[PDB]
Amino acid sequence: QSTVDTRQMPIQRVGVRAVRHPLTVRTAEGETQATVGTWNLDVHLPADQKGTHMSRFVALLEERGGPLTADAFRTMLATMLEKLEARAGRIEVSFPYFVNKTAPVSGVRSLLDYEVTLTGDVRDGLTRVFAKVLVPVTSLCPCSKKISQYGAHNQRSHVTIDAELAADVPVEDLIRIAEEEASCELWGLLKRPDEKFVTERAYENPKFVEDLVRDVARRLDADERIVAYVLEAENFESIHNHSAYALIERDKRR
Amino acid sequence: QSTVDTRQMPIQRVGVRAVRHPLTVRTAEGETQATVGTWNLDVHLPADQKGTHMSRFVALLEERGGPLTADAFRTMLATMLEKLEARAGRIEVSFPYFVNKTAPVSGVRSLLDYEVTLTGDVRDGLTRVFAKVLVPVTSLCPCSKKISQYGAHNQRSHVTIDAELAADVPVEDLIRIAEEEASCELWGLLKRPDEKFVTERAYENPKFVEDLVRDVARRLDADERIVAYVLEAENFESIHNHSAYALIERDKRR
Amino acid sequence: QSTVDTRQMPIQRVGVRAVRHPLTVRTAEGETQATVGTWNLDVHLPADQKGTHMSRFVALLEERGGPLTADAFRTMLATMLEKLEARAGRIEVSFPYFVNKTAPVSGVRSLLDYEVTLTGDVRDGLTRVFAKVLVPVTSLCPCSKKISQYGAHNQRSHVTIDAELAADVPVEDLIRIAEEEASCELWGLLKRPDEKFVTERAYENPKFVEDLVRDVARRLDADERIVAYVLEAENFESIHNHSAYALIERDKRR
Amino acid sequence: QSTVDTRQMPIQRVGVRAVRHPLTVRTAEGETQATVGTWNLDVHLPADQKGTHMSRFVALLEERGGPLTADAFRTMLATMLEKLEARAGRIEVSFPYFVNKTAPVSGVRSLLDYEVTLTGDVRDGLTRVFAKVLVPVTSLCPCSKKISQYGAHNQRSHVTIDAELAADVPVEDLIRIAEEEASCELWGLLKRPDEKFVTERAYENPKFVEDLVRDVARRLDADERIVAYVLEAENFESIHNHSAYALIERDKRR
Ligand SMILES: O=S([O-])[O-]
Ligand SMILES: O=S([O-])[O-]
Ligand SMILES: O=S([O-])[O-]
Ligand SMILES: O=S([O-])[O-]
Numbered sequence A, B, C, D: 001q002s003t004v005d006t007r008q009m010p011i012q013r014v015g016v017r018a019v020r021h022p023l024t025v026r027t028a029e030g031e032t033q034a035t036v037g038t039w040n041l042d043v044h045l046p047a048d049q050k051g052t053h054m055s056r057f058v059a060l061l062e063e064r065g066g067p068l069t070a071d072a073f074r075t076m077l078a079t080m081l082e083k084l085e086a087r088a089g090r091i092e093v094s095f096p097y098f099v100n101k102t103a104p105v106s107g108v109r110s111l112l113d114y115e116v117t118l119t120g121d122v123r124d125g126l127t128r129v130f131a132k133v134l135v136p137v138t139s140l141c142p143c144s145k146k147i148s149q150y151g152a153h154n155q156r157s158h159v160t161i162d163a164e165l166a167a168d169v170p171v172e173d174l175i176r177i178a179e180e181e182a183s184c185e186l187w188g189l190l191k192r193p194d195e196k197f198v199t200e201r202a203y204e205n206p207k208f209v210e211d212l213v214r215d216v217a218r219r220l221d222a223d224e225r226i227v228a229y230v231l232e233a234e235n236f237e238s239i240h241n242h243s244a245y246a247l248i249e250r251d252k253r254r
């Protein structure tokens, strides 16, 4: 339980990685969605302690019950520190999140999948909560449209908003900013009139990666509920075998 | 070596998987191209033989020298069967492959990467060789262009040609067929005149995934060198979070 | 809607790939488990038809309701052929599947995740249903144990049973054969006495990949409910950076 | 070039991502090793500049020639900033790296593959260079061995050393530190005497993930060349479907 002097050094994170467990989450309409999560749970290990208890992190996942409300997630972080007899720990869980969506012209309903990561960290007595969402959208190239007699190259794009939250934000709030700022958002089901609509909206609203990151960042900068964010936009170029990438990091405290 | 009756059954494939190993390949331009390969080497195991020798498959990779050519690959398949004391075996290697390309208007030269898989199988008295290439290309939707006042949804597409070879075929020949049948091919480096060119040609040549596979299949059908093939085209839809997909399978001997 | 003569050729499969949709499944205890699936839905396209309707495949997923019982899956395949106006189609869905498990000595309960793929194909008037499960287990090397004064090298292994089913088989039935034939099965939560138990059981039951595939195959050969299977075992070697792979394919009809 | 006030904000990172390109690296043994790299090239964008030139980043890759050495990598970072007309930028390349290795007893020679990431960042008037290597090793559980009558659960482990360099360090030096501190290192080709050797040494040298990271950290702390580092060790538990994980982060300037 105690370290040799050559091993007398603290470990910032020690725990389980990639544990797959089912979870239930709460929508902005208060409804519960069943999803599967990949969990990472770790604690700080004091220089003197030889090792953590790995079994306890799995035990905590089995014990937990109910929707993963922002309140339960904070409770889980505190439960882990008590179960593991630790003073500092991180819990991270990623899962696919589905929003029912209405086609722009037809009104036909379809689910779209977003990748959501929720991270809680307790270090220096300070509890920090982060919500990260990957939103798939459509991007059209302004240069292609300007220099071409007809057509404009467009590609699927991923906008990743990772935000430290001062207060509760629904993920739908983060998804909405990316979808509104995108040349055009994505629907799973589109009838012919909808395809006409999204083809035309994207062309009318071309955006480089730089344009998209700046437009999304300005909206994030205005939401007080967000204290700090890392914003990434990746355009999977249709005319190339690589991607165009823009990153903006903001810490309002600083 | 020796099996119990309960374990007295032949194993069609036994050996090593995912062995990463450097390899040099003689190109159509006669350059020796150095690339990294993931190797799968396996042999049929007779009911009475309890196990193959795993170390020998790795030893063959270390022993082998010089550029990989169609003749060298066949020689390796025979060498392995002799080394492993086996009558039937399969060798599969997948590696990134690069072709220097010339931009359509400016003529600027850039590398484009393809995924090549070379597979040799000896079984039932027959030696079969297969060349599989994943070709990245551009696809433009004919419906989007027809129904829209402006624009046409376009996206990166992968054309996978998996061909059993009656006669040796350079990978470049398979890549060329896919690139020619695509709405537009892909270049790593495009100048603004090139960007204008590829935007326009894609628009002038819209193809559905069904149109793309059918056009590639017709070229494969006309090729005396290819006895049989499994052809796949996937369109990574810009307007959707999923892909459009088509597969044509054909055996000339049928 | 009709093909040019150069494009007058049938396409075996045309449809959507990698569509992520939530689904509910039924356990062998008849209970319902909520899981997320990646769906692939395609139909055969007659030479004359220019193209399928891609929107309909997504519409079918949105329309479907209730647990995905083996009876619903057959109904869905028929519904798709009618919705898409086709005569032949394939529906494939993969999802993580969780079984609550009891530790061997402590009796502590933990969930384990398996990858389950369910595939339905309707071609030549014939309906075929396939259930594929990836089961994670533990493998110990017989050679290492025999030649070493102490210790024996052991690694996580994946056993993949893909089976065409004459009649309904619960996935738990397929998982059980792999877990019983493995040097030792896997538990998410293990107390110290359980770790002693699984350390010792694995050592007492060493199995090469060949031994494991043959032991599992014999059990599959005995289950009439299975008409044909592809069995794969991969050992992720702890002493190497590659894997040991064994494959057995059986078609009882043949 | 020119921004609106709403888009008047700096972008910390803008450029190309996931560009695949061949590269040659001079090895510690002075051999020129040809490998395939995935490149990420980005530059800081000033608030007033509306966009970077994407084509130039690809042009630099095509233009660059000769083996990648520490000096050459620094020269490329400067070349890119001049080519892109930028004052701050990052270049990151990841490639498979092979070291010929000698078996512990038989002395047979086999290649072992590592994942190398070289990152150069110029920002805030400071140029920072980092070498990151993923080293595959073997880990044996000390608890399994102590509590069991026979055997000890062991598994492949990845040790990732991400080091900021005060002075140039060959990747081989980082790999050696991880291999020496591991229960046992990995060889591609092992003869039966070698198998006996590595089985026994691992058993005689059991390490927990906390023990492994602490031992590697002590070597890194003693190294004058490394100013700072993020050290990760992941044990892909044979007895579990998840991984044990530990991370130590250290900045000497702190
Ligand atoms: O590595 S664990 O068992 O503290
Ligand atoms: O499987 S989760 O990453 O969507
Ligand atoms: O997990 S996100 O907060 O980096
Ligand atoms: O799996 S055995 O034959 O090394």
Ligand SMILES: O=S([O-])[O-]
Pocket (backbone or CB within 6 Å): B092, B117, B118, B119, B130, B131, B132, B162, B163
């Ligand atoms: O191995 S490829 O030819 O399917």
Ligand SMILES: O=S([O-])[O-]
Pocket (backbone or CB within 6 Å): B208, B209, B210, B244, C050, C051, C052, C053, C054
């Ligand atoms: O729209 S489809 O038929 O490629």
Ligand SMILES: O=S([O-])[O-]
Pocket (backbone or CB within 6 Å): C094, C095, C096, C115
């Ligand atoms: O995400 S499913 O493949 O487990």
Ligand SMILES: O=S([O-])[O-]
Pocket (backbone or CB within 6 Å): C092, C117, C118, C119, C130, C131, C132, C162, C163
């Ligand atoms: O999807 S399985 O049946 O090959």
Ligand SMILES: O=S([O-])[O-]
Pocket (backbone or CB within 6 Å): A208, A209, A210, A244, D051, D052, D053, D054
């Ligand atoms: O090409 S743009 O994204 O500067």
Ligand SMILES: O=S([O-])[O-]
Pocket (backbone or CB within 6 Å): D092, D117, D118, D119, D130, D131, D132, D162, D163
């Ligand atoms: O880029 S690596 O040094 O984190």
Ligand code: NA
Pocket (backbone or CB within 6 Å): A141, A142, A143, A144, A153, B195
């Ligand atoms: Na463009």
Ligand code: NA
Pocket (backbone or CB within 6 Å): A195, B141, B142, B143, B144, B153
């Ligand atoms: Na379309």
Ligand code: NA
Pocket (backbone or CB within 6 Å): C141, C142, C143, C144, C153, D195
């Ligand atoms: Na072994």
Ligand code: NA
Pocket (backbone or CB within 6 Å): C195, D141, D142, D143, D144, D153
């Ligand atoms: Na253990």
